[PDB]
Amino acid sequence: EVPLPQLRAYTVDASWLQPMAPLQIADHTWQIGTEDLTALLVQTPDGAVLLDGGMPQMASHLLDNMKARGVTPRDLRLILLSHAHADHAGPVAELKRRTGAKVAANAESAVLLARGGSDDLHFGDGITYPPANADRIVMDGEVITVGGIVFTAHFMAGHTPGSTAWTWTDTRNGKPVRIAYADSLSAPGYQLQGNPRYPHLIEDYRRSFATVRALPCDVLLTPHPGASNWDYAAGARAGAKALTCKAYADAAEQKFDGQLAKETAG
Amino acid sequence: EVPLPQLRAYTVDASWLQPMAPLQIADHTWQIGTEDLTALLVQTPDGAVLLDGGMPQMASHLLDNMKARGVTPRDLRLILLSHAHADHAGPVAELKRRTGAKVAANAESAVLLARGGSDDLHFGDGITYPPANADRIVMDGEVITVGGIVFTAHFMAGHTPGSTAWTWTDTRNGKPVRIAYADSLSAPGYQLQGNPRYPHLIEDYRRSFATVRALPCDVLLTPHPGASNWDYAAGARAGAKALTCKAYADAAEQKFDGQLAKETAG
Amino acid sequence: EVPLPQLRAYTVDASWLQPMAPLQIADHTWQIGTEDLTALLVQTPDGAVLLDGGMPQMASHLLDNMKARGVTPRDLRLILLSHAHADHAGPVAELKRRTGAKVAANAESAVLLARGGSDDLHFGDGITYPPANADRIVMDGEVITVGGIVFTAHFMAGHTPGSTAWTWTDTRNGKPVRIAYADSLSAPGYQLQGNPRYPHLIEDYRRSFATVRALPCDVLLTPHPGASNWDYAAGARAGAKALTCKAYADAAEQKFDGQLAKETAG
Amino acid sequence: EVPLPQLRAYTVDASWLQPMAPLQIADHTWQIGTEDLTALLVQTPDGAVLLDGGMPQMASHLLDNMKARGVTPRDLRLILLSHAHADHAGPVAELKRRTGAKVAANAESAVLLARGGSDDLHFGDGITYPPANADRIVMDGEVITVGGIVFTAHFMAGHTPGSTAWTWTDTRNGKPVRIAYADSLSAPGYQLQGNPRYPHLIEDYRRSFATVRALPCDVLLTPHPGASNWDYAAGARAGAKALTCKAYADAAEQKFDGQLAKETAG
Ligand SMILES: CO[C@@](NC(=O)CSCC#N)(C(=O)O)[C@@H]1N=C(C(=O)O)[C@@H](CSc2nnnn2C)CS1
Ligand SMILES: CO[C@@](NC(=O)CSCC#N)(C(=O)O)[C@@H]1N=C(C(=O)O)[C@@H](CSc2nnnn2C)CS1
Ligand SMILES: CO[C@@](NC(=O)CSCC#N)(C(=O)O)[C@@H]1N=C(C(=O)O)[C@@H](CSc2nnnn2C)CS1
Ligand SMILES: CO[C@@](NC(=O)CSCC#N)(C(=O)O)[C@@H]1N=C(C(=O)O)[C@@H](CSc2nnnn2C)CS1
Ligand SMILES: [Zn+2]
Ligand SMILES: [Zn+2]
Ligand SMILES: [Zn+2]
Ligand SMILES: [Zn+2]
Ligand SMILES: [Zn+2]
Ligand SMILES: [Zn+2]
Ligand SMILES: [Zn+2]
Ligand SMILES: [Zn+2]
C-alpha cells in the first residue's frame, strides 16, 4: 500500500551554503563562513576562537579559511556558539575531531548539542546534526579569555533555551570596537502561548529583547547576517547598513508582538 | 618526604544516615529517606515517583521502604530532584540500574548529575557521587503527570544553578493539600559577590526567594527537613512546627543578607 | 558560483518502510516492523522486550503494533540491538522518550548509539539518527532475563565493532524453539584490508562467521530478513525458506572472500 | 539505632602519592608521576602526550612536572590510558579542564571513564573518580601520531574490559628503543569463573597474556612500576631490573593460574 515517508534532509537556501573568502570585521575578527551564515574567527597571539560554524557540511570550508588566515588546526583553541541548531552548530563535532578546539557553552546549549539537535522543543527531530560534547559549561555573565581577548556570555533565552550573545572588544584603526554577536530573536512557526514544552517562552523573549537592547554594541553581528542588515557579499560596504543592537531588538519585538496577535487569531 | 593527601570521603552527621520507616505526609505522599534527609515517595495507580534519594549509600534502604509501601522496582517510574548534590541525588545512578525509573530534570541539574557532582561551582571535586543521565529535560513551569498526580517544576537557581521546587496536589482527610518541595536556599561557604563561576549569583538568589514565597504551599517540605522545621523522628508531630513557604523564604533571605555583610567584612 | 551540496537524506527502498501487521514467529515472539526491516517483540508476563526498531520514522508504527499485541508503553521494559546503524536503531531515542524502555548494549554499540551513528568507521556522517543513551552495558556471553525469557549476547564484531547476536528460547506447539537473531555479516563498500580505523577488521569477521555458525539456532532471524531468506509478506510461509545459521554464515563468508579478492584487484 | 556506614574514601599506600621529579626513560619519554604510579610524558616538536595520570589528586603535580619539562598546558595535546580505574585515570577530567588535552581511548575504556569508574564489574561504586569524556575512540591495532611519534593500541582485556597496551618507538643514545607500556594483568579479588558480569573473563586474560608476550618490547613499563620490577626512586638504576614483556606475561599467568586454583578451592 503506502510506505512510511522517507527521511527529509534539512535543505536551505543556496546562499546559506555559498562559500566566501574571509571578510575582515575588525583587527582580529573575521567572517569566515558563507554568504548567508555567520562563522566568526577571532585570532589572538595565543590561538584562535571560532563563534559558530554554520551548517554541517561547512567544516572543510571553515578549515580552509582558517588556513588562509594563518590558523592551523592545532591553533584553534575554542568554539563558542550562539545557539545549538543545525544551521549554526552543524559542523562542531567534526571540527572538534579535526582541530585542537574545545567547546564552551551554557547548560541548555550543551544538552541540545549533545543530542545533535534532536527532540527540539519546536522542531522535534526534523533538524538534527552530529552530536558533540561541551568541554566547559558557562554561566550568565561569565567571561572566557583567549590571548587577551575577553569574551562575555549574555544569556538571551527564547529562540532556544540556551541562546547566548557573546561580546568582546577588538580594535579598528587603533580604536576599541565593542563587538556584539547577538543570537537570533526569531520564533519561526513556534507556539508562543501556553506551550507545554516552554511555559515561560514569552517572558524569556521579553527579557531577551531587553538584554540585547543593553549590550555593549559598537558593531552588531548576528548568526543570520540579514537579521542585522549585514550583506557579506558587499565587500567594503558589507556592514555599512548594519543595525544597532537597539534597532535589532526593537524590530524583533515588533515582529514578535505581531506573531502573538496572529497566534491568538489562529 | 611528604605524600599528597589521601582522598577525603564525603562524611556527614549520623542523623543524615539514620534509616527510618515510611512517614506519611498525605494520602499518597511518604517520607522514605533518613531522619535528616528527605526522599519523597508519591504512589499513584500508574506507578510511583521518587523526589530525591539522599546520600549514595541510601539506595537499598529506599528500595526496602518502597517494598514496604507496595512499590516494586518495576513500579518506580520517575525520579525528580531538588538539586544534584551528593546528599540529595547520591543514589540516583544505582536506583536507575535497579528499577524501572527514569530521571526528569532541568538542563543545569542534568549536566551536574551527568558529571557526578564533579567540577562543582563552589565545592570543586570535593563532593562527587556516581554519575547518571537524565531521560527527560524539563523547562521552568513544565508539568509532568503520573497516575493523575501533576508535578510542576519551579526553577529557583542559587544553591545550584539547577535548583528546583516541585509542587503537586495530594489529598488529606478528603481535602486537597498543595505540597511544595522547595529546594535549599543556603549558600554554605559560597563566594557570593563577584564570583567568576556564577556572576549573577546574588540576583538569582533574590529571584528564588520570591519564587519560594509565591509557591502554592499548604505543606512545605525541604531536602534537609530542619530547614523547614520538620522533625521526621517526631511521629504524629513530625510536621507540626513546619514553616510556611513565606517564612522559609524570609528566613533564608535574612540569613543570606547577613552572609553578604560578613563577606564584605571578610 | 557553486554552493556546497545540500545535506542528503538517508533514503531506502520502499519495502523497508512498508508497515506490516504483527507476524508471529513463536509463542511469545513477533515481527512488528516493516516488510523488509526486522523489529522483534518478545512478550512476557513481566513486560516486553524489543530487539531493533528499524528506521527512525518507524517509532509510531512500532507503538501501534505493540498496542495491537496488548503491550502499552509502560509495558515495554527493554530494548536490545543487533547493531547501532540508522536502519536498525533509528527510533530508539524516541521509543525511550515515549515508553518505559531501557536500552542494554555492549560498549561499542553504546558509544555509536550515543553519537547517533555519526563518525561511522566506514560511512562518516552520511547515516546519522537521533542519539540515545544505553542504561546497561553488557559483556560477551552475558545474559538478561525478562519475565523468565533469557536473552544471551554473542558478540560478532565486523559489520560494526559492536555487532551482536541475541539468542533466546521460546516455545512453539509446546516444544522449545531456540531463536537466534544474528546480526548482519555484510561489509557494504567497506575497505577491508589495511583499514586504519579498523585494523583487525578481517580477523573479526572471520571469528564472527564462526560465532554465527555455532549459535543455538532452531530458527534464524536477521535484521534484514532477506539475508536469512525470510519473506515477511508471505504469511504462513514467511519463514519456510529461512536459512540455518550455518548456511547464513557460509554464504556471508563466501561473499566476504569474493569482496576481499575484488578489493585486491581494485 | 545504627546509621548506614559513612562513605569510604579510596585510600592507597603513601608511596603511590609520593611526588617525584621527572625521570627520563628515553630521549623524549619521561616518568612524571609518583614513586609508585606511572604517568608517562612523551614530548614531541608538535606537542606532548600523557599516558595515564595516576590518582585524582595528582593533577597539579603532573602539571608542575610538565612545566619543568617545558610543556605548558596548551602544549599537552593527547591523553592515552592503560585502563580507566581511579588510580590511573583519576585526574583526567581535571587535566582536560586545565590543558589543551584530548582523550583517545577504546569504547570500553571510554564508557568506564564517562561514568567515573562507577558500576565497576568487580568493585561496584567503591572506587569512583571524576568522569571524563573521550574525544576519539580507537580500535585494536589503531595508530595515533603526534609530532612524528607513532603510538599503537594493543587491546589486552582482562583487568578491565578496555585494558590497553600502548607501544611506540623512541630513541636512546642514538638508537631506536621500542617502548611497551603494558597494562595491569592482575585480577585482585575478582571472581574469575562463571562471573555473570564478565562471562569470558578467563579466555580474555589468556589472550591478553599472549598479546603482552608478543609486544615489541625493548623496554617494558607498567602502570604500577613494581609489576615490571621498576624502582622509580632508584635514579640511574630505576629500570635496571625491569622485566621483559615475556617475563611479565609469564609471571602474571602463573599468578592467575594459582588464583584460579584457589577460587576453585574456595
Ligand atoms: C533551524 O533553523 C531555522 N529554521 C529553518 O532553517 C527551516 S524551519 C523555520 C522556517 N522558516 C530556525 O531556527 O528556525 C532557521 N534559522 C532562524 C534563526 O533565526 O536562527 C530563522 C531565520 S529567519 C532570517 N533572518 N535573516 N535571514 N533569515 C533567513 C528561520 S530559518
Ligand atoms: C553538599 O552538601 C552540603 N554541604 C555539606 O554537606 C558539607 S560542606 C558545607 C557545610 N557546612 C551543601 O550543599 O552545602 C550540605 N547541604 C546544604 C543544603 O542546604 O542543601 C547545607 C545544609 S544546612 C542545614 N539546614 N538544615 N539542616 N542542615 C544541616 C550544608 S550541608
Ligand atoms: C546503514 O545501512 C546499510 N547501508 C545503506 O542502507 C546504504 S549504504 C551501503 C549499500 N548498499 C549498511 O549498513 O550498509 C544497509 N544495511 C546492510 C546490513 O547488512 O545491515 C546492507 C544490507 S544488504 C541486504 N541483505 N538483505 N537485504 N538487503 C538489502 C546494506 S544496506
Ligand atoms: C583500583 O585499583 C586497584 N585496587 C586497589 O587499589 C584496592 S582494591 C584491590 C586490592 N588489593 C585494582 O585495580 O585492583 C589497584 N590496582 C591493581 C592493578 O594491577 O592495577 C592491583 C595492583 S597490585 C601491584 N603490582 N605492583 N604493585 N602493586 C601494588 C591492586 S591495587
Ligand atoms: Zn535556530
Ligand atoms: Zn538559524
Ligand atoms: Zn546542596
Ligand atoms: Zn544538602
Ligand atoms: Zn548496518
Ligand atoms: Zn542494515
Ligand atoms: Zn585497575
Ligand atoms: Zn592499578
CB nearest A135 (choices: D77, D96, D136)? D96
Sheet holding A219-221, edge to edge: A143-146, A149-155, A164-172, A175-181, A219-221
CB contact residues (below 8 A), chain B span 74-133, against chain C = 74, 77, 96-97, 100, 102, 133
Which residue in A158, B182, A58, B2 sits closest to D14, CA to CA?
B2
Residues D251, D233: Cα–Cα separation, whole Å:
23
**How many CA atoms, within 13 angstroms, populate the side-chain half-sphere of residue C86?**
24
Q: Where are the beta strands (DSSP E) in B156-239?
A: 164-172, 175-181, 219-221
SS3 D107: helix
In this structure, which residue's CA is closest to atom 16 in ligand 2? Answer: B87
Q: DSSP assignment of B83-137, as one string?
A: --SHHHHTTHHHHHHHSS-EEEE-HHHHHHHHTTT-SBTTTBTSS-------SEE
Other CB atoms within 10 Å distance of the CB of residue A251: 16
3-class secondary structure per residue, B9-26 = CCCCCHHHHCECCCEEEE
Residues A209, B132: Cα–Cα separation, whole Å:
36
Which residue in D118, D242, D95, D115 sits closest to D182, CA to CA?
D242
Q: What distance, in Å, lies between the first and last C-alpha atoms of chain C?
A: 35
SS3 C227: helix
For A175, the enclosing helix (H) or strand (E) is strand A175-181
Q: Where are the beta strands (DSSP E) in D35-141?
A: 40-44, 47-51, 76-80, 102-105, 136-137
CB contact (8 A) between residue C100 and residue B100 = yes
Active-site position among A88, A120, A154, A205 = A88
SS3 D143: strand
Residues D80, D154: Cα–Cα separation, whole Å:
12
Q: Which residues contact B240 (CB under 8 A, 6 or more apart)?
A: B234
SS3 C26: strand
Q: Which ligand 4 atom sits nearest the alpha carbon of residue D86?
A: 1
Residues A125, A131: Cα–Cα separation, whole Å:
13
For D203, the enclosing helix (H) or strand (E) is helix D201-213
- Site to probe by mutation for ligand 2, drawn from B10, B186, B208 as the one with most ligand atoms within 8 Å of Cβ, is B186
Residues A164, B66: Cα–Cα separation, whole Å:
43
**How many CA atoms, within 13 angstroms, populate the side-chain half-sphere of residue D238?**
19
Q: Is B227 left (phi over 0), alpha (psi -120 to 50) or beta?
A: alpha
Sheet holding D149-155, edge to edge: D143-146, D149-155, D164-172, D175-181, D219-221
CB D55 within 8 A of CB D93: no
For A65, the enclosing helix (H) or strand (E) is helix A59-68
* Resolution of the PDB structure in angstroms: 1.6
Which residue in C56, C151, C164 sits closest to C109, CA to CA?
C164
In this structure, what are the phi and psi dihedrals at residue C206, rounded to the nearest 5 degrees?
-60, -40
CB D84 within 8 A of CB D53: no
Experimental method: X-ray
Angle, alpha carbons A31-A37-A38 (nearest 5°): 35
Tell me the angle at which helices A107-114 and B107-114 cross, rounded to the nearest 10 degrees.
70
SS3 C61: helix
SS3 A82: coil
Query: Can you say whether the dihedral through the CA atoms of A151, A155, A158, A162 is positive or negative?
Result: positive
Q: Which residues contact A93 (CB under 8 A, 6 or more apart)?
A: A116, A129, A130, A131, A132, C115, C118, C119
Other CB atoms within 10 Å distance of the CB of residue D24: 13
Residues B15, B36: Cα–Cα separation, whole Å:
6
Q: Where are the beta strands (DSSP E) in C83-174?
A: 102-105, 136-137, 143-146, 149-155, 164-172
| Beta bridge partners of residue C204, listed in sequence order | none
The parent domain of residue C226 ranges over 1-266
D85 has catalytic annotation: yes
CB contact (8 A) between residue D200 and residue C141 = yes
Q: H helices within chain C, ranges in order?
A: 59-68, 86-89, 92-98, 107-114, 201-213, 245-265
Residues B103, A244: Cα–Cα separation, whole Å:
43
CA A112 to ligand 3 centroid distance, Å: 30
Give contacts of A136 with chain D, Cβ < 8 Å: 97
C-alpha cell at B112: 551536574
CB C220 within 8 A of CB C245: yes
Residues C115, C152: Cα–Cα separation, whole Å:
25
CB C29 within 8 A of CB C170: yes
Other CB atoms within 10 Å distance of the CB of residue A165: 22
Identify the burial level of C156 via C-beta atoms within 10 angstroms of its C-beta, where 0-12 means exposed, 13-18 middle and 19 or more buried.
buried
Whether chain B has a CB inside 8 Å of the CB on A214: the answer is no
CB contact (8 A) between residue C135 and residue B74 = no
SS3 C225: helix
**How many CA atoms, within 13 angstroms, populate the side-chain half-sphere of residue B121?**
27
CB D151 within 8 A of CB D49: yes
**How many CA atoms, within 13 angstroms, populate the side-chain half-sphere of residue B152?**
15
CB nearest B198 (choices: A107, A139, A162)? A139
Which residue in C243, C168, C253 sits closest to C211, CA to CA?
C253
Compute CA B252 distance to the chain's CA centroid, rounded to the nearest angstrom: 16
In order of B58, D102, D266, the CA distances from A230 in angstroms are: 58, 37, 77
Q: Which residues contact C144 (CB under 8 A, 6 or more apart)?
A: C78, C80, C104, C136, C138, C150, C151, C153
Which residue in C246, D3, C25, D116 sits closest to B130, CA to CA?
D116
In this structure, which residue's CA is closest to atom 23 in ligand 1? Answer: A186
Going by the DSSP 8-state scheme, the letter that residue B229 receives in this structure is T
| Beta bridge partners of residue D179, listed in sequence order | D168, D219
Q: Which residues contact C183 (CB under 8 A, 6 or more apart)?
A: C82, C83, C156, C159, C163, C164, C165, C222, C223
Single-letter amino acid, residue C260: L
For C79, the enclosing helix (H) or strand (E) is strand C76-80
Residue with cell 535543505: A11
Identify the burial level of D131 via C-beta atoms within 10 angstroms of its C-beta, where 0-12 means exposed, 13-18 middle and 19 or more buried.
buried
CA A83 to ligand 5 centroid distance, Å: 7
Number of domains in chain C: 1
Residues C73, A138: Cα–Cα separation, whole Å:
37
Residues C220, C240: Cα–Cα separation, whole Å:
11
Q: What distance, in Å, lies between the first and last C-alpha atoms of chain A?
A: 35
Compute CA A73 distance to the chain's CA centroid, rounded to the nearest angstrom: 21
Q: H helices within C99-224, ranges in order?
A: 107-114, 201-213
CB D176 within 8 A of CB D197: no
Identify the burial level of C44 via C-beta atoms within 10 angstroms of its C-beta, where 0-12 means exposed, 13-18 middle and 19 or more buried.
middle
Sheet holding B76-80, edge to edge: B23-26, B29-31, B40-44, B47-51, B76-80, B102-105, B136-137
Residues B160, B85: Cα–Cα separation, whole Å:
8
CB nearest A139 (choices: B137, B141, B161)? B161
C-alpha cell at C201: 577488521
Residues A253, A259: Cα–Cα separation, whole Å:
10
Give contacts of A200 with chain B, Cβ < 8 Å: 139-141
In order of A185, B38, B228, C67, D59, the CA distances from B242 in angstroms are: 44, 14, 6, 47, 46
In this structure, what are the phi and psi dihedrals at residue B145, rounded to the nearest 5 degrees?
-115, 130
Please tell me if the CB atom of residue D188 comes closer than 6 angstroms to any atom of ligand 4.
yes
Other CB atoms within 10 Å distance of the CB of residue B147: 14
Query: Can you say whether the dihedral through the CA atoms of D204, D207, D213, D217 is positive or negative?
Result: negative
C-alpha cell at A100: 585542537
SS3 C77: strand
In order of A261, C151, C260, D59, D95, the CA distances from D103 in angstroms are: 51, 34, 34, 15, 10
Q: Which residues contact C119 (CB under 8 A, 6 or more apart)?
A: A93, A97, A130, C125
In order of B133, C84, C93, the CA distances from C114 in angstroms are: 12, 9, 10
C-alpha cell at B142: 513544565
C-alpha cell at D144: 595515533
Q: DSSP assignment of A26-57, as one string?
A: ETTEEE-SBTTB--EEEEETTEEEEE--BSGG
Query: Can you say whether the dihedral through the CA atoms of A80, A81, A87, A92 is positive or negative?
Result: positive
Residues B5, D94: Cα–Cα separation, whole Å:
17
C88 among annotated binding-site residues? yes
